[PDB]
Amino acid sequence: YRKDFIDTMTRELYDAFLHERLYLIYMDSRAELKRNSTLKKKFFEKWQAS
Amino acid sequence: LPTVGFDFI
Amino acid sequence: DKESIV
Amino acid sequence: TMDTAQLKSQIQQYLVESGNYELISNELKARLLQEGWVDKVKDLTKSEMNINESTNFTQILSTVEPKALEMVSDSTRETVLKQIREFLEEIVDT
Amino acid sequence: LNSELLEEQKQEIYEAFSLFDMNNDGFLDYHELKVAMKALGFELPKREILDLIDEYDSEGRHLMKYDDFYIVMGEKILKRDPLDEIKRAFQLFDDDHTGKISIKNLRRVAKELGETLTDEELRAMIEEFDLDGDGEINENEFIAICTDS
Ligand SMILES: [Ca+2]
Ligand SMILES: [Ca+2]
């Protein structure tokens, strides 16, 4: 059934597009945390030692 | 061109 | 099965 | 003749070569930005990376996607699904 | 370059790269490279990134190896504006955006870093540099702490 094949592929393709969006946002946010953790840790320790 | 995040296959 | 694309 | 793996590999090669990969990807990220989806997902992802970042991953994404799937506006989801199906209808034979 | 960078900064580079080296093969493609640099506080235009990859891309793979990443980021970290980092840090402490670092803020940061510190020790950290006597640290006071050298 061509329509069953197309509907399934449409659903799997949609999942992929969305998973990719999530993947990139996940990568983006993850960079933000490391950068934020690095800054806070640096300046906290600097503070705790002043 | 498609990123690894694209899990179609 | 037997499906054909382009 | 053609098995599922071949068919899907062929569907994706054509999706990218036809340029429809970028058109759909772009349309989607534009619709998702319009409805503030990214920011909620950013907070969700950032909130879920917490309480404890356990830095070997990604078990967590499996939990975030479901609500994120539901969190997509019906307008965006239906619109994008319509584009995808349109591309497939043009490419599948018989 | 080895002497110029602090032990803290060398680790910062190593961790940024490792976090996004998904294959664990010592290489980053464009996407992985973009966020790895963002992890070090560098947001570069797409064109500028392609130039960086291409400048060191011997193979034609369009990948960056760690040893080039280390040199490249190392130079950039030495060019960091000291005051901008401090102000950015302040905003991270002041997540509630009250314009001042409360004890709640400092305690929240202390928990994230897994610091074992008594409330009194935290209260003291504020008292020692609280110039207004408002029990909280504003931006200028925060800078004063970090600029002492
Ligand atoms: Ca890699
Ligand atoms: Ca004060």
Residue numbers in the entry:
A (entry chain B): 756 to 805
B (entry chain G): 331 to 339
C (entry chain X): 325 to 330
D (entry chain C): 2 to 95
E (entry chain A): 13 to 161
What did the article's authors report about this structure?
Crystals with P3221 symmetry that diffracted to 3.0 Å resolution were obtained from a solution containing Nup1322–355 and Sac3757–787:Sus1B and crystals with P21 symmetry that diffracted to 2.6Å resolution were obtained with Nup1316–340 and the Sac3753–805:Sus1B:Cdc31 complex. Molecular replacement using appropriate search models derived from the Sac3CID domain complex showed clear difference density due to the Nup1 fragment, with the side chains of Phe336 and Phe338 being especially clear. For the P21 crystals, Nup1 residues 330–339 were easily built, but density for residues 316–329 was not observed, even after repeated cycles of refinement and rebuilding. After refinement, additional weak density was observed between the N- and C-terminal helices of each Sus1 chain that appeared to be due to a second weakly bound peptide chain that was tentatively assigned to Nup1 residues 326–330. Vague density was visible in the place assigned to Nup1 residues 326–331 in the P21 crystal and it appears that in both crystals an additional Nup1 peptide chain became bound at this site. In both cases, the density due to this additional peptide chain was poor, consistent with it being bound weakly and/or sub-stoichiometrically and is likely the result of the peptide being present in molar excess during crystallogenesis, indicating that the binding of this second Nup1 chain was likely a crystallisation artefact. In the final model of both complexes, the structural arrangement of Sus1B bound to Sac3 and Cdc31 bound to Sac3 was essentially unaltered from that observed in the absence of Nup1 (17), consistent with Nup1 binding not generating a substantial conformational change. In both crystals, the principal Nup1 binding site was based on a cavity formed by Sus1B helices α1 and α2 and residues 757–787 of the Sac3CID domain helix. The Nup1 chain adopted an unstructured conformation and the interaction was dominated by burying the aromatic side chains of Phe336Nup1 and Phe338Nup1. The interior of the binding cavity contained two deeper hydrophobic clefts into which the aromatic side chains of Phe336Nup1 and Phe338Nup1 fitted snugly.
